[PDB]
């Protein structure tokens, strides 16, 4: 009664007042709770579950099942209290104040007998009121919970069920683990449709049925740090909270949640703008403003991104897995920097894992983390920890030919399944990344490659890695005609690093054909060529 | 929330004691977008130390007075809260928890409180441990129901080490990335603050001082961020002018930079 009201909140009285949101679904889970609560001994369930799957929502479904009377008669007219363990530790400076407050709770529960004492965060019970010489609240409740003279629901994260309830193996016996699972997407749509009126009333927006269908499928496909019955409400809220913001009714639609999810992970999931659609159809031409003369790769990386933006990509494979073969200097990294520029506006927005820094496996732990017990376990992996922050991210495995024979086998799981578990124990998704594998690659008597370079990738890579690469693109060597076009790119933006009184270099002369000649060989690339443009016409016309 | 463990930033913004915030108008909208949510309305401000994360909230506390609210943030007082000040003075049981349950009792009774807690790496382990009762166990039931609006502030590493490693704390604080400002954005910060620094030091800060303070601070100082290492240069130069006494220019902020870094002349 009055003792329980000052140490906790009545959830049954909160369900009479309508303060608990509707719990649509979870009928078989609340039935499992009421099954455990109707036992004679050890009538104590624990809603173990992933964080955010609605563990405390199942009990809110129970508190409004008592008010509706949908409980069995053994649980009819029960008063379900969220026991605030901080309220019991509060004002317990002296010895025996906490143990007095906990026995005063239990004396009221034995008196009334209609109390189900929901202890949210049951891992906090081990060590609750534990001082130098005190009795923790576990050891006071253990005779109560074992005899079934105290009905108590727990709610614990599965991570927090190992560390504090399985490290107290006596207390684990007193409870029953009711596995509250991560629901399916169709169950989450019914959760969202049942919560339609609560978020219509607070955000003052109508939320359509397709928006509920989107925010369950969009969250499951494109968000991995949370769980379904929460990361779907999360997209419904910041939809409607933006409409309270920008209007200071407007319906929440598929476009209103996809623009939230685009501002959430950085993954463009939009119902596409016509201006965005035009630059995707001419993506192969708008990547011709940084690289020229490929015409097979710049088309085939444009096919993979349009396949992603039209939603026709395999939702368990990456957005595009490529090998950029060919001779050196033909625009391999310069296409990946162009591909990152189209998708982000930043050339350093890609994740360049230099595979030349790896040659063995005994340093290969910076891309999938260190295993437990070994150093580098709490900051495990530099590839994974940058991809779970940018799930849409072109990553660039530059110079894979200088790497180990058993480091791309770690990435062999990334190409098909789109995942990679780091050493920490956490699965990161590569399903939305664009994987790039840059590789630097006739002899004798023949009547007059593409064939030998496939054989030399078959020598270097296993044919099981090439099996999982979506597009293998051998690059064509730069013709002397298009080196005329290549030097025109340097006199514009690398001469745009220059200040526009310190230069006048767009001359339109015929001496650029001499600049096209100096710095290029049939064995060299255009890098020994981009250096000669800087140090001969740009950087020495600037120091005066 | 008492004025013992923090202060009312909206009552300070009504009296005009907070810094004028020029820039960060897009970040304040993202904080209002997270604060206007029915559940999980808890924006953690992820940014490098001293990029203006309080200056987001000081500008947000002004926007309560200026009326830029989404009508769910209307007439909401915003008490800042030092989470470590509740920790300070706790050697015995129920010292931290009593002072934390008091300040949460004064939110349910008052009913318009938006806590700004800094140092959310202190939140995990504010008490003895996680199995013990800490502030990362008391706040969490009310941070999932939207009955408690707390604005956070981590670095990015503190967010990775203490919140992303904490199960069931990632889902309760929603990330708002306060970025590192550019050099022109930093000058516009200094153009708005100059009515405070010229009226406090009783000097005149020229326009040439601020274009140098946004350039020399990036050029010479790398252990600390811009929207603070540039504010500091025109702060100490006004104090050095008050001490030597008046006009601050790119020569008055000059020797202030030479005081710290190992530059003989």
């Amino acid at each position: 009664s009055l003792v329980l009201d000052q140490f906790g909140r009545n959830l049954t009285a909160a369900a009479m007042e309508g303060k608990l949101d509707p719990v649509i679904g979870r009928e078989k889970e609340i039935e499992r709770v009421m099954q455990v609560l109707s036992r004679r001994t050890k009538n104590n369930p624990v809603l173990i579950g992933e964080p955010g799957v609605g563990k405390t929502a199942v009990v809110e479904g129970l508190a409004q099942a008592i008010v509706h009377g949908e409980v069995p008669e053994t649980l009819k007219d029960k008063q379900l209290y969220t026991l605030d363990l901080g309220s019991l530790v509060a004002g317990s400076r002296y010895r025996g104040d906490f143990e007095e407050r906990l026995k005063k709770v239990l004396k009221e529960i034995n008196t009334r007998g209609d109390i189900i004492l929901f202890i949210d965060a049951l891992h906090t019970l081990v060590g609750a009121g534990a001082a130098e010489g005190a009795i923790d609240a576990a050891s006071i409740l253990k005779p109560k919970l074992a005899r079934g003279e105290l009905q108590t629901i727990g709610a614990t994260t599965l991570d927090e069920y190992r560390k504090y309830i399985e490290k107290d193996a006596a207390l684990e016996r007193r409870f029953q683990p009711v596995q509250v699972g991560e629901p399916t997407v169709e169950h989450t749509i019914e959760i969202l449709k049942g919560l339609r009126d609560r978020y219509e009333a607070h955000h003052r927006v109508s939320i359509t049925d397709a928006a509920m269908v989107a925010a369950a499928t969009l969250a499951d496909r494109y968000i991995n740090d949370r769980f379904l019955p929460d990361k779907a409400i999360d997209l419904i809220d910041e939809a409607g909270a933006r409409m309270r913001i920008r209007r200071m009714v407007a319906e929440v639609d598929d476009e209103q949640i996809a623009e939230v999810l685009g501002n959430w992970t950085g993954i463009p999931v939009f119902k596409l703008t016509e201006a965005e659609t035009t630059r995707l159809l001419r993506m192969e031409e708008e990547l011709h403003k940084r690289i020229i003369g490929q015409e097979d790769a710049v088309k085939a990386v444009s096919k993979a991104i349009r396949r992603t933006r039209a939603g026709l990509k395999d939702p368990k494979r990456p957005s595009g897995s490529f090998i950029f073969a060919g001779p050196s200097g033909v625009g391999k990294t310069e296409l990946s920097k162009a591909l990152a520029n189209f998708l982000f506006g930043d050339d350093d927005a890609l994740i360049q894992i230099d595979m030349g820094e790896f040659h063995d496996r005994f340093t290969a732990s910076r891309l999938f983390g260190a295993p437990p017990g070994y150093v580098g376990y709490e900051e495990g992996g530099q590839l994974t920890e940058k991809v779970r922050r940018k799930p849409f991210s072109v990553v660039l495995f530059d110079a894979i030919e200088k790497a180990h024979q058993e480091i791309y086998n770690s990435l062999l799981q990334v190409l098909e399944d789109g995942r990679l578990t780091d050493g920490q124990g956490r699965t990161v998704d590569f399903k939305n990344t664009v994987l790039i594998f840059t590789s630097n690659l006739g002899l004798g008597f023949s009547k007059g490659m593409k064939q030998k370079v496939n054989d030399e990738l078959k020598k270097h890579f296993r044919p099981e890695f090439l099996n999982r690469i979506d597009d293998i693109i051998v690059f064509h060597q730069l013709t002397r005609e298009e080196i005329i076009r290549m030097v025109d790119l340097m006199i514009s933006r690398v001469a745009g690093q220059l200040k526009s009184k310190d230069m006048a270099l767009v001359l339109t002369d015929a001496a650029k054909a001499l600049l096209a000649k100096r710095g290029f060989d049939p064995v060299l690339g255009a890098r020994p060529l981009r250096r000669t443009i800087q140090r001969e016409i740009e950087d020495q016309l600037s120091e005066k | 929330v008492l004025d013992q463990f923090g202060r009312n930033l909206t009552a300070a913004a009504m009296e005009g004691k907070l810094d004028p915030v020029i820039g960060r108008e897009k970040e304040i909208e993202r904080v209002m977008q997270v604060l206007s949510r029915r559940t999980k309305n808890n924006p953690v401000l992820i940014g490098e130390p001293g990029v203006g994360k309080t200056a987001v909230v000081e500008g947000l506390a002004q926007a309560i007075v200026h009326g830029e609210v989404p009508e769910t943030l209307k007439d909401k007082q915003l008490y800042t809260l030092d989470l470590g000040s509740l920790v300070a003075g706790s050697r015995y049981r129920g010292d931290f928890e009593e002072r934390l349950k008091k300040v949460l009792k004064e939110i349910n009774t008052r009913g318009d409180i938006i806590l700004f807690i800094d140092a959310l790496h202190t939140l995990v382990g504010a008490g003895a441990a996680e199995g013990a009762i800490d502030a990362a166990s008391i706040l969490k039931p009310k941070l999932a129901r939207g009955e408690l609006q707390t604005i956070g502030a981590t670095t990015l590493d503190e967010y990775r080490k203490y919140i992303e490693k904490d199960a069931a704390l990632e889902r309760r604080f929603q990330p708002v990335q306060v970025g590192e400002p550019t050099v022109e954005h930093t000058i516009e910060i200094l153009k708005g603050l100059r009515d405070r620094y010229e009226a406090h030091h009783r000097v005149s800060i020229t326009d040439a001082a601020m274009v140098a303070a946004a350039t020399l601070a990036d050029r010479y100082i790398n252990d600390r961020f811009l929207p603070d290492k540039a504010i500091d240069l025109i702060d100490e130069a006004g104090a050095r002018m008050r001490i030597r006494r008046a006009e601050v220019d790119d020569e008055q902020i000059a020797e202030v930079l030479g005081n710290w870094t190992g530059i003989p002349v």
């Binding site: 400076r93 010895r95 025996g96 534990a130 130098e132 005190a134 017990g373 070994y374 | 050697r91 129920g94």
Partner: peptide, 24 residues
């Protein structure tokens, strides 16, 4: 590579309850 991490667990910094001295 096979450099072990050495957990190095601290002793428990914990609270203390109180016997109190009675006064009028």
């Amino acid at each position: 590579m096979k450099v072990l991490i050495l957990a190095c667990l601290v002793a428990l910094a914990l609270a203390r309850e109180l016997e109190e001295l009675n006064v009028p």
